[PDB]
Design a protein around this ligand. Sequence first.
Ligand SMILES: CCCCCCCCCCCCCCC(=O)O
Lengths: 10, 12, 246, 232
Amino acid sequence: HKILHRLLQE
Amino acid sequence: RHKILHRLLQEG
Amino acid sequence: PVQLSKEQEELIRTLLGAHTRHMGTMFEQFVQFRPPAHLFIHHQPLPTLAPVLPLVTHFADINTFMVLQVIKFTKDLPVFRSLPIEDQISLLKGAAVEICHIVLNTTFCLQTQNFLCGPLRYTIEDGARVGFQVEFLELLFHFHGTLRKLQLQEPEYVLLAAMALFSPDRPGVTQRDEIDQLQEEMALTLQSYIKGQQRRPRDRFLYAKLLGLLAELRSINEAYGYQIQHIQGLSAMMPLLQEICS
Amino acid sequence: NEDMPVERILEAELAVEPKTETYVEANMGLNPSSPNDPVTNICQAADKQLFTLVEWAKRIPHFSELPLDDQVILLRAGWNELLIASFSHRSIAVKDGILLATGLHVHRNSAHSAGVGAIFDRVLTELVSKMRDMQMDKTELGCLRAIVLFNPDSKGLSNPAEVEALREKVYASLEAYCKHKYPEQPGRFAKLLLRLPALRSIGLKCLEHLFFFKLIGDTPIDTFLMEMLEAP
Ligand SMILES: CCCCCCCCCCCCCCC(=O)O
């Protein structure tokens, strides 16, 4: 799940 | 078309 | 500890009238569907290499039979018999399955995590043997853990059944006005009983949680339907369900 | 229950929604090449509203506190019913139509004409209609969009008792704001919950559609949206 992970972080 | 159900819901 | 009007009183009196006459005690009848031996002798599962078919023919037998009682149940209803056939059908196709689980859970043993239907005791690998994908059974079993844990007095159980049933949003419904208000009606009749909790061994937001479950039961209705087709010929064995899931 | 501030909720809702609410009409969608093809527009709108869904989640009391994987779980299996109820509420300000996040109204006619009438009508009669005939404010919406977020029963949840903790807190705040703000109607808190089973079914049916345009449909699906759907 590339996209989902990045968002929940930044 | 929904044979048995029709059948069933008929009467007692 | 709230009231239950003169109407709400009779509502519960007729739900059980038809429930005790058709469901509830139907679990002690499962034994007459040529139940495999290992069910009686719960001290061990189906032999690693035994034939499965004897069991499956029992499964589809009590399933088709259960759905039959659910129907016998809805006919002992003035209001349901009062709905046009095209809707009774849409309400049965939409509720029927959900309604079975609801009743079923009353036999569920919290400790063992098994269904004790009289002398028989069904476990989670039985369903697995019958072919049901793992997750479905995992999901489906959590549901009952959750539901049984709430501890719902018999009446608290029947109402919920009614609520699953009288859902206006079901596809095919034609008098969505009547059903929408029958739904509005049930919902309320139960919210009253919940507040009138003599012993408070249960939750505060019981109702609020129960809806989560009526919602989960929807997920369930749909997931089961996919199961009994993804399973070779099984669908064929219980033509009644086949229509409920059509 | 002061721990879950309704003000953070409504503030999170208010943070989400656009600042420029303009709307155009979508053609009857008979060609996947028109700048207004119905099917295609909803997928363009769901990709978009999926991004903003993340932030809306964040801005919800305590969601950032949760483990990084329990966040993804609750989202992965919720985004659907989330985005749905969002636009359902949003579209109360028009009749027989659906207002998109891309700033595009979608008539009931362009629906049937594009094959997806049945589900459209179910949204209308089950969510939108229902909300309107009950004046549910953006704060009440928020509590519901939140309760969906807090589905303890998710599969793979590292802590199903912890997530069920949050949902009982909102259960409190919500029944509070209701019996508070709307005293005349007591059982208003529950009226609001009645729409949950419906949102589920509606959520499920909506999925199938989405799977269908992927599998079949030439219908161009995009990134964020694509990733959210992965079930045989
Ligand atoms: C009403 C149309 C129903 C059939 C089409 C498929 C629906 C699934 C898409 C999820 C909804 C995205 C909504 C974006 C928004 O908030 O504007």
